[PDB]
DNA sequence: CGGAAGAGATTCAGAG
RNA sequence: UCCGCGGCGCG
DNA sequence: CTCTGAATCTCTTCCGACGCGCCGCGA
């Protein structure tokens, strides 16, 4: 229509709004009830808003279009269409101004901070409680002075008419119109440069920028106080009839009426010369009425109606989940849709869904009209309608003709991830249930216990082409969350295949030879041999040769009849070995995956369908079933339980003799019950799992049992070892609601009856779990909404940015366990640098190569330990990411195509598993390797051991090929029994430490001499009359005297002559201070060896909250402090609770001082040389400081590691890319440290793209570029921080962002996805992307 | 339940909700994100503008479908005009640019 | 008359329902026998003792 | 019927570009009424266009040159018509 | 309700 | 031809 | 002994899935 390019917002000038309005409304009247006609000058006055009916005058003067576009003479109504009623806005004119409640009440008082006034004063003047002052030079009274009534009278009775004092509305209007902007701008900036206080500086800066925003928008600030108030058109605030002729009035109409009434009252009291207090009361009521109209409930008590409910003001029509933004602009209701209960249909091919005939007829009724007239069977739409409503079977023939290639979309609420909507080619069935193919039903997360599903039909041919090419289920084989296929069988299919491939030691026809799988099928179907019988069969297989031909091979192999039968369906090219074992769920999954990699898409689809058919058929023929005799109870159980209860009695009587504390008695009982439960479980599994049967020759032999429940568990079709354990073994301990474990475990299994007590205590867990999931759903949905909002802008916009930067990928290893191999972390990513063959300079993998499966296998063969890959966070693309930095698209297998929206994919991929999350002294070598130290400094002693002065060293055990095997952190001062590079074996002790104390280490031998210490002041003389030998303890600051304050207890080391030995490498003396409350085992004046120690020192949350805190950039409550500077630590002044630490740079001239608290244990002893980003004290880690110290790569590695850790603990797989993209989206805001020659002001928040572009052009013309630091804002703030104010207003805090944009004079270019979705043009992603490129070229041409 | 076409609401001009009113299903925001995950722009545009809210575009679409031509002409969602009128009535001036 | 999937039973742990099924097969069993014992129209004393 | 389009996508490479090309081809086949280049077998214009691009007979540049030559034919008809009108006036 | 974040007001410590 | 509010109900 | 800045305390505001189905009531 109007083809707008952007949207602009600003304050409303009163002349502008008056120009909008086609008239003023002056009375609270709406419509007459004798005749349902609007009253003139009323809220629905037709003379203003136009006629109620098309071209119908209120007077009845004219009735048809012959006079279209003329006014009546008897009345001012116009001969036009009713649509104008929707458009035209009225206006009302107030006898007094009124503050617009938004600018007052918004969290920063924009008017208040503009005028520097406290909000209490502003409300006390605007609400008519006090006067305020405007000054004249003859009076000492200054302007903006608050003035109470007694002060008002006191001032006026001496200086009346010399100064002036007014109430809130008029005074604020006059003040705003009586101030200049440039003078206050310059005074504010001069104060900013002259002042120092950071609070004062930030207030000054925000005022400066507010004034700059007002001047650059040119919006006269006084406009913030309304003087003329718009009237919403009648249709948007409809008055709707009711039964009995009543009418429901929209609350907006009542608020408007009240405001009209108050305005009329105030004008009448003014024009008849009322006394002062009366008109003041009336105008205060009018101001309150306007506040109610705009934002009822925003201040004080909310207005309410007869229903005792608060009325919904205008602001409530846009705020909240019922608001206009969320309810209608997004999430429209749609035509051509249906819903129905779903149902299994196994006879369907993969790509076709069974759609009830009635729904098809209803949906395609327009298409049927069309084709029926086209084929000449019906002449007019009435004929078509009457024919289709009579269902003349020719309509059924036409209906079968129309849909033959017409895909439809199936959707299941909630649409957790994009698989939730899929496309199918319909097939017509009588009945009323929609029939799905079970395989895709598994992907839907759907079930068949009564889940409904909704169906939409695309209209246009471009739309149906999109549905076919993109959405058809034959395309969505690979999940976006990971590369593994999503179309995977379960339940009966897996059970059937498992039964079909399981062999037994002796069966009908064992040992015969079959010339081909067809004969195997014959012998099975003719009943002369059972599936399980082992036999030799001649089989042909094929392989993809070096050229790409399917070269054949034929041979005899040992197999089972069932296995040959299954092989017969396998397509050419897969090796026979894939089948020749007991096929579980995982085996079938990897079989489908290997089919998809070796062959194309369509052979895999056909293979899937054939698998489904054969599995179902043979499962049915199997007749597997569950019976009460199957859940065998191991007869050992009674004995084990008697033993356990005997031990319980023993420990209980041991406590009865008082030999132990009750807590340890509880612990012992719990331990023995757990041990007994495990023993019973093992006995049950052993008895169930295997059984003895006679062989062919007549002897007993063991084999895997065909017990039904065991077969179901072992196949992986359904159930688990836990459920089997509960079914037959004793189910064990259970927790009280506090999470503590009841001493008496539930002893009876499910097969025997549970007593009432066991059942009752068990119900605790059941209701805990149900409440748990009920609550978790909401948090998961909320989190997903957030992630989507933050990442929705990001789209692949170019092929290659040309960045050599990237991140280093190594396998994730914790505590000697390889939690994640390198192949998974690097598959599908592009090499940032050329990979070299280990130990050589030869290039193994070139730079900028997408690492597919063959490259990963090659990397594994050469045992490459680390790779460097391109990352989303390191991409140089502006307003997007390049295809090479993102890498392989999980859903397709190759490099991602241009124009794909990746952020939304990542957001859904993170959100969906969230439904599954839960929410309420020595080192031993594990295996062979070599010991290496990551970062260490070590000293060796007379005992032959090694003691370490690095506080964050890690042992790493390395493979003979240089790959890592194990790694473990080692505390300060631990003792080590081995040198670096020595060989190690499993179970070998290599290092030791006391975890219950902190030592202090002396590197060189010598004679200790106490220094800077006095007994009873810095140290006190412990003689442990109750414990043992003499000792000395440093007196804490509360215990030490003032003489012990500046004297810091220490010991120097001296030579044999008593001369103070120097540190071996520095000019500092070998001086070792004793921290507060430190303990030393040695007295003054004793010898100590090199590498020897003397010091004694006194020394979890749920997954979903943890991930929420990570992505919200939450500051941890005990932030570890790290060295902001490279230098030497140094002590200094002391004060209450906090120590004045200082770091002194080695070469730098700028020391820094920090208020390090003393209650946290310090890891610094006045000798620790330290570098930037090194830990000074431990604790939870603050992401912002990590970013400041160690850069973007450190923080991205930290975030990805934590999120992957929690998810892998749950067992869900999510590729790192979807976390890295979120991290890059978090990282937009930067701050300017110097402007160079740029126009940017210092300390401003700027989007990283803008400053990057500005610096690039600035250096492109040779000027000094600006410098910046990047700030990790939380995802909520980062989503609100965007320039696209429309998206922000859609998301949260609508009033705040609207006010901010309004005062700013913001403009949004409508470049993201959400904005275009609101507007309704094509999104700039996917197929729409191309449409935009031409447009932008035209916009470049324009 | 199934709805090809029927009644339309007064204020928002969107189709009615619920079986009793013979309304259509709701293409909730989660489904919109699902479409955004695909490159399927055209079906999204059709879902929002023509099928739902364009007071004239859906008439044109009905005409063309009856005629057997699967054209499309996206106008402007009337709910957007409703939002504009409410924001203006609030006293905040908002307007389109580059007409 | 009705065919149910067995796979649900171990994973939902509705073991009791299987027992119900068994009792059902027992219950109608007696019914069937007594039905036949009635259909042959034998002496009521025999069915009384049964 | 068409089980999958993946071969056509391989030919065009960009999946979305395939959708656009097939869309315009089907548009001109339906309203313009130009006949399919391959047998139709009671299929629909959509799958017809998909097969045609699958055979490599139809591609963005091929559409471009076809549109160019059709425009040249139309303008030749216009010029010959106006020359005939002038000959009628003379 | 509870938890988290922001803004304003009040109190304590350090420096003069 | 309709704005809801409250309530249960199934996903 | 006093003043300013920084830190701490108090008060106020915002947020805690999507989807359908019936019943009642309604200044
Ligand atoms: Mg279900
Ligand atoms: Zn008139
Ligand atoms: Zn890049």
Swiss-Prot record, chain A:
This is DNA-directed RNA polymerase subunit beta'. PANTHER family: DNA-DIRECTED RNA POLYMERASE, DNA-DIRECTED RNA POLYMERASE SUBUNIT BETA. It is an enzyme of class 2 (transferase). One of its GO terms (molecular function) is zinc ion binding. One of its GO terms (cellular component) is cytosolic DNA-directed RNA polymerase complex. Pfam families: RNA_pol_Rpb1_1, RNA_pol_Rpb1_2, RNA_pol_Rpb1_3, RNA_pol_Rpb1_4, RNA_pol_Rpb1_5. Belongs to the RNA polymerase beta' chain family. It comes from Escherichia coli (strain K12). Its EC number is 2.7.7.6. Keywords: Acetylation, Antibiotic resistance, DNA-directed RNA polymerase, Magnesium, Metal-binding, Nucleotidyltransferase, Transcription, Transferase, Zinc. Zn(2+) 2 binds at residues 801, 875, 882, 885. Binds 1 Mg(2+) ion per subunit. NCBIfam families: rpoC_TIGR. Acetylated on several lysine residues in the presence of glucose. The keyword Cell membrane does not apply. SUPFAM superfamilies: beta and beta-prime subunits of DNA dependent RNA-polymerase. GO terms for biological process: bacterial-type flagellum assembly; bacterial-type flagellum-dependent cell motility; cell motility; cellular response to cell envelope stress; DNA-templated transcription initiation; intracellular iron ion homeostasis; nitrate assimilation; regulation of DNA-templated transcription elongation. DNA-dependent RNA polymerase (RNAP) catalyzes the transcription of DNA into RNA using the four ribonucleoside triphosphates as substrates. Resistance to the antibiotics salinamide A, salinamide B, rifampicin, streptolydigin, CBR703, myxopyronin, and lipiarmycin can result from mutations in this protein. InterPro entries: DNA-dir_RpoC_beta_prime, DNA-dir_RpoC_beta_prime_bact, RNA_pol_asu, RNA_pol_N, RNA_pol_Rpb1_1, RNA_pol_Rpb1_3, RNA_pol_Rpb1_3_sf, RNA_pol_Rpb1_4.
Curated annotation (Swiss-Prot), chain C:
Co-administration of salinamide and rifampicin or salinamide and myxopyronin suppresses the emergence of resistance to both antibiotics. Acetylated on several lysine residues in the presence of glucose. It comes from the Bacteria. Belongs to the RNA polymerase beta chain family. The RNAP catalytic core consists of 2 alpha, 1 beta, 1 beta' and 1 omega subunit. When a sigma factor is associated with the core the holoenzyme is formed, which can initiate transcription. The rRNA transcription and antitermination complex (rrnTAC) consists of RNAP, NusA, NusB, NusE (rpsJ), NusG, SubB, ribosomal protein S4, DNA and precursor rRNA; S4 is more flexible than other subunits. In pull-down experiments interacts with CedA. (Microbial infection) Interacts (via flap domain) with Escherichia phage lambda antitermination protein Q; this interaction renders bacterial RNAP resistant to transcription pausing and allows it to read through termination signals. DNA-dependent RNA polymerase (RNAP) catalyzes the transcription of DNA into RNA using the four ribonucleoside triphosphates as substrates. This is DNA-directed RNA polymerase subunit beta. It comes from Escherichia coli (strain K12). The gene is rpoB. The chain holds residues 1095 to 1144 of 1342 of the full protein.
From Swiss-Prot, chain D:
It catalyses: RNA(n) + a ribonucleoside 5'-triphosphate = RNA(n+1) + diphosphate. Keywords: DNA-directed RNA polymerase, Nucleotidyltransferase, Transcription, Transferase. One of its GO terms (molecular function) is DNA binding. It holds the Pfam family RNA_pol_Rpb6. It comes from the Bacteria. The keyword Protease does not apply. The keyword Signal does not apply. InterPro entries: DNA-dir_RNA_pol_omega, Pol_omega/Rpo6/RPB6, RPB6/omega-like_sf. Belongs to the RNA polymerase subunit omega family. The RNAP catalytic core consists of 2 alpha, 1 beta, 1 beta' and 1 omega subunit. When a sigma factor is associated with the core the holoenzyme is formed, which can initiate transcription. The rRNA transcription and antitermination complex (rrnTAC) consists of RNAP, NusA, NusB, NusE (rpsJ), NusG, SubB, ribosomal protein S4, DNA and precursor rRNA; S4 is more flexible than other subunits. HAMAP family: RNApol_bact_RpoZ (MF_00366). Promotes RNA polymerase (RNAP) assembly. Latches the N- and C-terminal regions of the beta' subunit thereby facilitating its interaction with the beta and alpha subunits. Part of the processive rRNA transcription and antitermination complex (rrnTAC). The complex forms an RNA-chaperone ring around the RNA exit tunnel of RNAP. It supports rapid transcription and antitermination of rRNA operons, cotranscriptional rRNA folding, and annealing of distal rRNA regions to allow correct ribosome biogenesis. This is DNA-directed RNA polymerase subunit omega. The lineage of its organism: Bacteria, Pseudomonadati, Pseudomonadota, Gammaproteobacteria, Enterobacterales.
């Amino acid at each position: 229509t109007e083809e707008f390019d952007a949207i602009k917002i600003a304050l409303a000038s009163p002349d502008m709004i008056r120009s909008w309005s086609f008239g003023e409304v002056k009375k609270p009247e709406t419509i007459n009830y004798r005749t349902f006609k609007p009253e003139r000058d009323g809220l629905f006055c037709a003379r203003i808003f136009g006629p109620v009916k098309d071209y119908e005058c209120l007077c009845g003067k004219y009735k048809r279009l012959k006079h279209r576009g003329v006014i009546c003479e008897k009345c001012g109504v116009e001969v036009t269409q009713t649509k104008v009623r929707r458009e035209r806005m009225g206006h009302i004119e107030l006898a007094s101004p009124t503050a617009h409640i938004w600018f007052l009440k918004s969290l920063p008082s924009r008017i208040g901070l503009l005028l520097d006034m406290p909000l209490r004063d502003i409300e006390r003047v605007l609400y008519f409680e006090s006067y305020v002052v405007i000054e004249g030079g003859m009076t000492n009274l200054e302007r903006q002075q608050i003035l109470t009534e007694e002060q008002y009278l006191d001032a006026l009775e001496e200086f009346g008419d010399e100064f002036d004092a007014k109430m809130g509305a008029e005074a604020i209007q006059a003040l705003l119109k009586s101030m200049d902007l440039e003078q206050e701008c310059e005074q504010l900036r001069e104060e900013l440069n002259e002042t120092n206080s950071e609070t004062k500086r930030k207030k000054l800066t925000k005022r400066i920028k507010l004034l700059e925003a007002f001047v650059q928008s040119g919006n006269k600030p006084e406009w913030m106080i309304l003087t003329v108030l718009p009237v919403l058109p009648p249709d948007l605030r409809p008055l709707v009839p009711l039964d009995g002729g009543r009418f429901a009035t929209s609350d907006l109409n009542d608020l408007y009426r009240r405001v009209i009434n108050r305005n009329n009252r105030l004008k009448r009291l003014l024009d008849l010369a009322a006394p002062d207090i009366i008109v003041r009361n009336e105008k205060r009521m009018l101001q309150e009425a306007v506040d109610a109209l705009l934002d009822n409930g925003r201040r004080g008590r909310a207005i309410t109606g007869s229903n005792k409910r608060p009325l919904k003001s205008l602001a409530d029509m846009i705020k909240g989940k019922q608001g206009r933004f969320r309810q209608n602009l997004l999430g429209k209701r749609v035509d051509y849709s249906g819903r129905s209960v779903i149902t299994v249909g196994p006879y369907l091919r993969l790509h076709q869904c069974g759609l009830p005939k009635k729904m098809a007829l209803e949906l395609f009724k327009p298409f049927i009209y069309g084709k029926l007239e086209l084929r000449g069977l019906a002449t007019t739409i009435k004929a078509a309608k009457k024919m289709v409503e009579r269902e003349e079977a020719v309509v059924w023939d036409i209906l079968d003709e129309v849909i033959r290639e017409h895909p439809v979309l199936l959707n299941r609420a909630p649409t957790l991830h994009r698989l939730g909507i899929q496309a199918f080619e319909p097939v017509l069935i009588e009945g009323k249930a929609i029939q799905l193919h079970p395989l895709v039903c598994a992907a839907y997360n759907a079930d068949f216990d009564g889940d409904q599903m909704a169906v939409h039909v695309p209209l246009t041919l471009e739309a149906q082409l999109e549905a076919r090419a993109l959405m058809m289920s034959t395309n969505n084989i690979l999940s976006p969350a990971n590369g593994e296929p999503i179309i995977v069988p379960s339940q009966d299919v897996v059970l059937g295949l498992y039964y079909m491939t399981r062999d037994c030691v002796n069966a009908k026809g064992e040992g015969m030879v079959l010339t081909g799988p067809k004969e195997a099928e014959r012998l099975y179907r003719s009943g002369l041999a059972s599936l399980h019988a082992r036999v030799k069969v001649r089989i042909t297989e094929y392989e993809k040769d070096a050229n790409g031909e399917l070269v054949a091979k034929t041979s005899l192999k040992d197999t089972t009849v069932g296995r040959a039968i299954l092989w017969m369906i396998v397509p050419k090219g897969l090796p026979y070995s894939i089948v020749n074992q007991a096929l579980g769920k995982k085996a079938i999954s990897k079989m489908l995956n290997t089919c998809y990699r070796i062959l194309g898409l369509k052979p895999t689809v056909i293979f899937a369908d054939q698998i489904m058919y054969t599995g179902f058929a043979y499962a049915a023929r199997s007749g597997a079933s569950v019976g009460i005799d199957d859940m065998v109870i191991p007869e050992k159980k009674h004995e084990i339980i008697s033993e356990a209860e005997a031990e319980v009695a023993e420990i209980q009587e041991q406590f009865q003799s008082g030999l132990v504390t009750a807590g340890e008695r509880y612990n012992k009982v719990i331990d023995i019950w757990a041990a007994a439960n495990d023993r019973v479980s093992k006995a049950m599994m052993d008895n169930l799992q295997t059984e003895t049967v006679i062989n062919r020759d007549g002897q007993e032999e063991k084999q895997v049992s065909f017990n039904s429940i065991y077969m179901m568990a072992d196949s992986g079709a359904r159930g688990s070892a836990a459920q089997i354990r509960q079914l037959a073994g004793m189910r064990g301990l259970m927790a009280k609601p506090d999470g503590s474990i009841i001493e008496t475990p539930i002893t009876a299994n499910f097969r025997e009856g549970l007593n009432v007590l066991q059942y009752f205590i068990s119900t605790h867990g059941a209701r805990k779990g149900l409440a748990d999931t009920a609550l978790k759903t909401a948090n998961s949905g909320y989190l997903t909404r957030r992630l989507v909002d933050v990442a929705q802008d990001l789209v692949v916009t170019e092929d290659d940015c040309g960045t050599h930067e990237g991140i280093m990928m190594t396998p994730v290893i914790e505590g000697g366990d390889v939690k994640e191999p390198l192949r998974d972390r690097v598959l599908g990513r592009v090499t940032a640098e050329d990979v070299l063959k280990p130990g050589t300079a030869d290039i193994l993998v070139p730079r900028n190569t997408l690492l597919h499966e063959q490259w990963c296998d090659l990397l594994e063969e050469n045992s490459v330990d680390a790779v460097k890959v391109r990352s989303v966070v390191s991409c140089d693309t502006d307003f997007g990411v390049c295809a090479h930095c993102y890498g392989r698209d999980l859903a397709r297998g190759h490099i991602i195509n241009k124009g794909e929206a990746i952020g939304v994919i990542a957001a859904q991929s993170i959100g969906e598993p969230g439904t599954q999350l839960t929410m309420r002294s020595s080192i031993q070598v594990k295996n062979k390797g070599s010991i290496k130290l990551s970062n260490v400094k070590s000293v060796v002693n007379s005992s032959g051991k090694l003691v370490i002065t690095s506080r964050n060293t890690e042992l790493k055990l390395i493979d003979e090929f240089g790959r890592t095997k194990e790694s473990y952190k080692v505390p300060y001062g631990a003792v080590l029994a081995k040198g670096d590079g020595e060989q190690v074996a499993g179970g070998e002790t290599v290092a030791n430490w006391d975890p219950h104390t902190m030592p202090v280490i002396t590197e060189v031998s010598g004679f200790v001499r106490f220094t800077d210490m006095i007994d009873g002041q810095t140290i006190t003389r412990q003689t442990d009359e109750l414990t043992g030998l003499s000792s000395l303890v440093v007196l804490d600051s509360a215990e030490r005297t003032a003489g012990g304050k500046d004297l810091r207890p220490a010991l120097k080391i001296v030579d044999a002559q008593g001369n103070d030995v120097l540190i071996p490498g520095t000019d500092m003396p070998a001086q070792y201070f004793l921290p507060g409350k430190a303990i030393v085992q040695l007295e003054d004046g004793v010898q100590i060896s090199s590498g020897d120690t003397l010091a004694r020192i006194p020394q979890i949350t749920g997954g979903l909250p943890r991930v929420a805190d990570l992505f919200e950039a939450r500051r941890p409550k005990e932030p570890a402090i790290l060295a902001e500077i490279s230098g030497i630590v140094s002590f200094g002044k002391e004060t209450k609770g906090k120590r004045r630490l200082v770091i002194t740079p080695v070469d730098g001239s700028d020391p820094y001082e920090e208020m390090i608290p003393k209650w946290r244990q310090l890891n610094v002893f006045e000798g620790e040389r330290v570098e930037r980003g090194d830990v000074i004290s431990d604790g939870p880690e603050a992401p912002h400081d990590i970013l400041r110290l160690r850069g973007v790569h450190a923080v991205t590695r930290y975030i990805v590691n934590e999120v992957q850790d929690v998810y892998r603990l749950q067992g869900v797989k999510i590729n790192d890319k979807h976390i890295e993209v979120i991290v890059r989206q978090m990282l937009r805001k930067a701050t300017i440290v110097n402007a160079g020659s740029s126009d940017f002001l210092e300390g401003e928040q700027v989007e990283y793209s803008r400053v990057k572009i500005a610096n690039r052009e600035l250096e492109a013309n040779g000027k000094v570029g600006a410098t910046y630091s990047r700030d990790l804002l939380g995802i909520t703030k980062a989503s609100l921080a965007t320039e696209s104010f429309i998206s922000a207003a859609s998301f949260q805090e609508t009033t705040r962002v609207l006010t901010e944009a309004a005062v700013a004079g913001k403009r949004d270019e409508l470049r993201g996805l959400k904005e275009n979705v609101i507007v309704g043009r094509l999104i700039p992603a996917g197929t729409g992307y191309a449409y935009h490129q031409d447009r932008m070229r035209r916009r470049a041409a324009g | 339940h199934a709805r090809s076409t029927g009644s339309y609401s007064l204020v928002t001009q969107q189709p009615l909700g619920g079986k009793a009113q013979f309304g259509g299903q709701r293409f909730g925001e989660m489904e919109v994100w699902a479409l955004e995950a695909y490159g399927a722009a055209y079906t999204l545009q059709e879902m929002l503008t023509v099928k739902s809210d364009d007071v004239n575009g859906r008439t044109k679409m009905y005409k063309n479908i009856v005629d057997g031509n699967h054209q499309m002409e996206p106008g402007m969602p009337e709910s957007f005009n409703v939002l504009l009128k409410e924001i203006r009535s609030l006293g905040i001036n908002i307007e389109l640019e580059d007409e | 008359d009705i065919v149910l999937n067995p796979l649900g039973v171990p994973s939902r742990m509705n073991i009791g329902q299987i027992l119900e099924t068994h009792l059902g097969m027992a219950a109608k069993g007696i019914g069937d026998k007594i039905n036949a014992m009635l259909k042959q129209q034998q002496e009521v004393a025999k069915l009384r003792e049964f | 019927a068409r089980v999958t389009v993946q071969d056509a996508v391989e030919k065009i490479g960009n999946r979305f570009d395939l959708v656009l090309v097939a869309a315009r081809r089907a548009r001109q086949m339906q309203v313009g009424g130009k006949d399919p280049l391959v047998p139709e077998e009671n299929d629909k214009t959509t799958v017809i266009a998909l097969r045609e691009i699958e055979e490599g007979l139809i591609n963005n540049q091929i559409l471009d040159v076809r549109e160019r030559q059709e425009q040249q034919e139309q303008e030749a008809a216009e010029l010959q018509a106006v020359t005939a009108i002038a000959e009628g006036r003379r």
